[PDB]
Point group: D2
Chain length 408, copies 4
């Protein structure tokens, strides 16, 4: 069986995949996205230019790569077309599953009204997927048919629209948008299951880019604050129509400390000066809001958990430099839970307290390209993570520069 | 003195300028925007394609036109660059005032945090204009200088940023965005006052597109629900550096009934079935929210007021067909205010009640291209508006089709 | 019967249509090209930008216009795609006849080899049209089928390829180009006869742009130096599938003097200083070679001939200023042919000698916008042309500026 | 001293660099072009799309790469802008030497007239370089100044223009083109010597792409049929302002047989069926003319010569499969010259006759990825080339597929 490698962020997201996935792409013929909406992915700076890949697989920055958006992705044609515009010609380089669900204008309108009543459109688009009332990319090949079906849907749903105080979308406008999507996307729409199976049959090199944090997995992450989809490696197989025998090497991507964007259990969070420092140095700041992210110490219990959920062959450790010059650093080696010490991630994480090992910091790992040259305390910290995680660290990034990486 | 014609919406906006301004552009060498941010303008459908002109003057759809964004406009480079992308080449067709104020990323972030604490960035950008702490388009010609100045500004303001819980913007990111704006916008940035004066000196044909509803004028509109800027015709002169002797023909654009998007005094609002019908037939629905706009009967007191504020030579009456098949239609000829009948717009409009004339409806004006062929009741309604407004109606639009228009 | 207006150059080309057609377009819903390859049309400068319309109708500079490339045109997909790239979005604005003949790469290769043996590809593409072995635009909707058919054609023709010493085109390359043409052109390809008939049925305004000089007409022009196609007005009807009852107003475009680009009979040619002056002032210089065109005095015999061939309602007289400051100007009022004076264009034009009237020049018509203000000698010259041509002059252009035009 | 690697074609061109350079680029930070005009480079197919890099370095297909067009290149702004259009955004990825010579419209016109009198514009642009009358890229930063200087040049040269029968270029047109070049190219124009020196100082990875066949070198190639510039490795250093100490690894690219496009000495040419077969299988066919290239057996004397001229560390052997199924293959191991056997390339190559070794062919090397799996006769042929060339073969390409390559 010819196999696909897999790469996933094993935290709450922002593990810094981009530097990693981007370097790796050169070695693959196919780069594939599996699940999630456009809440996934990342932005990446290349030679001073900002690239958004929320929908598109990272391989689109490597013209040799063929990039597949799989059955599992929830695709907004608007967001996709806007991302495509960052490139001159993607034909032959980008294929979109005819089975991927559409997140259309009306999903955004529904989403907005719902927030009032208390990545737009993703939730309602997923809902329509699960209720099997939504429509899929292949239907864009028949805009007039799709438009008529949608109009029928809205009618049948009119009380839902009234309850949200939004009018039934215009048929004229809808047809015009659908025709536009048809004209633009037709050359990219294909059966991606057939194509990906063919690639593996021909022994081509295939990378699956898991697009979201393992701790955000709908089943295994810290529920309710999680995404709507499976984020772990077997989920990546599923969204692409691949089977467990087709899983190759699997690399987890992990920061040397932890962050969360929103609310939800965060055992190792540091609300004092250490955390604040991490936030500044690590630049963990929402691009859209300018808000500082929540920051905390490396959580080895959470990481061991997601390592096992993903079946990691290797860890790629990021932003180690962000800890330069800390006198002491913490690792959470276990939890205090309901009066006991536990080694695992319980379903109610809000009830655990971190149990820390303290370790001696270092002056600088920043920029270092050679393992031996690392501050001895940094070597100890790395070895301690590896040990607690249960997975070898094969990659260390000592700075934002693509060039500064240590290989083990 | 060689003169510039002017066109303004004389209601609360959405008067339907686009059909009007677009037809007129063919006859002008220069089309100019004066004030406001990107909350102004409109979108227009051409041969099935949706065009956003919020920032850009409508003349950009007529390659013969030179389009000026004046000193008075508050320009977001991001929004402007995105609008420009709808066109292949605007060089020589589009010029941006080096004196126009910049609405940058940080204004959006400020704007968002401010909403929490209770067209992004427009308010804070205007505030920086009035406090004379903001920066202007010409400064983009020196990105490094502008970047340094902005960094200094943020530092001096750091407590304001702390109070909003948003971090000081990255210097690296800022320089990169400013350099990008510089590289892209350099060919369009010029002294627009010198250029427009030259055009009039050479007896070129000039149209000023007022971009916002007269009833939304900051001074004369229904305060607090108004925009931040002057919307009436003399304001249009001011934003472009033009003097009262340079005002030509001035056309007001008015719907055959009235709408408001948000809250605020609306004397002629109809919250019953008539209003609902108007909303549906007139398609008065927020493009972004799908929410029905507030609708009401033509207000002749408000229209006489804005006609005089603008110094209208002529009215262009829009969406007359939206009243097809009403048995009876209303016109508000006066108000009941503090126990009296009044003929004017008082500063506190929330205290007036409409005094209506009722008039007999008609079956169809829809599609009619000849004045004589109009239902006699429609002729009476038109004559009655003209009389109450104090301005001749020179244009009647009987449907969305560019072709269906009556000239008087 | 609802009708299409027509505009044609009535000389040997370069009559200066662009200023004329461009001004007129604003008044039409449809602008149509009829016959010829990409040897037709012109380039036009707008606000300092150079636009090539060889294939595309001039109406593409007026987003309100719908532009039709008719059955009669010989379309090179490469040249067409390159012209389209001057615009951001033409969808809904540009339609290409599914019956138009394709001028493909191999026609260019054939064309080149044929020149050796003694607008590339046009001749061989026309030949394939007349022999009914060529393929048409609609076939691009099935690239694989078209590719297979072409391969079969080449095989059957292999001795022709051997005789030209060019190899049989690659099937792989051909499929790739055809697929590309398919992906790009699909949204523009339609039945243009049905569409144009519908437009006239709906009483839409239609302009047919004749793309080549009447004296270059294959039947009526100076043979052998002529184009391969009919250039006169009834030919314009034919290429679009229109009937004689559908012909509206017909405007001929004529320069105040005459030019020819290549060899061939040119009765009024002036090979001395007068001609040289005309060439310089009129800027009659090949854009691609920098070669001076042949120039000569107005030929009233040729113009009366093409006026009658076209059925002109009106003349539009161009570049009158180019004669400013001539002490004397000539008009050829008749010919000396085989010992007689003749009033007509004989089939062998190389055998005629011009018979001139001499007339008094003027100082300047340049820039003049008012008929009355014209130098009296210029009025006399204009009246004399009109008289000899048999058609009223309704348009006079006194300079390159769009604004400088006199209407009669 | 930090060093730049170099890659050159060591034949008459078409050695098949693209597959090679493209694979290598992923490993470099900078990819640089040194000399030549747009007669150099190649086209490359990526995932079914045709890319022209005549001017641009091959690294532009790898967004991580920074691409430098060096002092030595003769740059046509038109050709460069057209090549750039194949990409959406090159800012930060492409820099053009402010010292590179300009090949402008008038050079093309001169070039055309000169052919009459018996990659347009290249020759006359080079001539202007050598006579020190030409202008360079940096001058585009002052279009008005450059335009004035050029006008002065043309005047001083007017008899040259008269002798060529082409008019003095329009000042208006020239300014408009120069302004356009200025607006478009400003963000890419820099001092490339300073930039490249900085890169090496910072120990960045640098590849120099030699753009033309070593046997076409102006000094060392088969004169008069050669290009105008130095094509060998030290020439590549010179065009970029690099010194001999900065030369790294140098890879020669060589086909398993030989081709020439035009006339000129070609010792190993085969004008019979063997050569014809090579031409068909190797697809050696002019893309623009469809003409079969001249083909011949591998010339070991020529290859040893260019290996030494370039200082090759390694050979990369291409199109070995094109010889599949030949019963016998030839290698030219020496020449008969003026009655003697010689081992070197004499200045008059038209006077040598090939002295062949004959060797046993093989069935298929096509597609083979493993050295050991090669037909034993193929191993012998490879070993024999290496031996005669004096350079190890480190790369073997067994087919067009990027994937089919053997590494030694
Ligand atoms: Cl691209
Ligand atoms: Cl455009
Ligand atoms: Cl456009
Ligand atoms: Cl790109």
């Amino acid at each position: 069986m010819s196999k696909a490698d897999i790469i996933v962020g094993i935290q709450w997201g922002d593990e810094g995949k981009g530097k990693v996935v981007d370097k790796l792409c050169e070695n693959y013929d196919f780069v594939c996205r599996s699940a999630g909406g456009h809440n996934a992915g990342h932005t990446i700076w290349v030679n001073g230019v900002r690239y958004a890949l929320h929908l598109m697989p990272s391989g689109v920055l490597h013209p040799r790569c063929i990039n597949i958006i799989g059955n599992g992705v929830v695709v907004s044609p608007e967001v996709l077309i806007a991302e495509m515009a960052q490139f001159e010609n993607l034909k032959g380089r980008l294929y979109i599953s005819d089975r991927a669900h559409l997140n259309l204008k009306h999903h955004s309108l529904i989403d907005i009204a719902k927030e009032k009543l208390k990545g737009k459109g993703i939730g309602p688009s997923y809902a329509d997927k699960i209720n099997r009332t939504g429509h899929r990319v292949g239907e864009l090949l028949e805009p007039q048919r799709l438009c008529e079906a949608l109009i029928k849907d809205f009618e049948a749903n009119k009380t839902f629209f009234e309850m949200l105080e939004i009018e039934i979308p215009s048929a004229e406008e809808l047809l015009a948008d659908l025709k536009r999507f048809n004209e633009i996307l037709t050359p990219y729409i294909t059966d991606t299951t057939r194509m990906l199976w063919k690639a593996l049959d021909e022994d081509k090199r295939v990378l699956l880019e898991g697009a979201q944090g393992s701790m955000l997995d709908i089943d295994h992450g810290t529920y309710p604050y999680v995404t709507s989809s499976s984020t772990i490696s077997a989920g990546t197989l599923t969204g692409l129509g691949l089977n467990p025998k087709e899983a190759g090497n699997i690399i987890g991507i992990v920061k040397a400390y932890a962050t969360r964007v929103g609310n939800g259990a965060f055992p190792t969070e540091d609300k004092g000066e250490d955390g604040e420092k991490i936030a500044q140095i690590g630049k963990e700041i929402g691009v859209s809001t300018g808000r500082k992210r929540r920051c905390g110490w490396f959580d080895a219990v959470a990481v061991r958990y997601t390592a096992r959920l993903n079946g990691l062959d290797a860890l790629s450790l990021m932003k180690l430099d962000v800890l330069d010059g800390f006198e002491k650093i913490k690792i959470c080696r276990a939890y205090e839970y309901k009066g006991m010490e536990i080694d695992y991630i319980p379903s109610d994480l809000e009830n655990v307290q971190p149990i820390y090992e303290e370790m001696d910091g270092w002056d600088k790992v920043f920029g270092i390209k050679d393992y031996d040259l690392l501050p001895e305390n940094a070597k100890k910290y790395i070895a301690r993570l590896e040990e607690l995680a249960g997975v070898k660290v094969k990659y260390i990034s000592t700075s934002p520069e693509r060039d500064d990486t240590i290989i083990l």
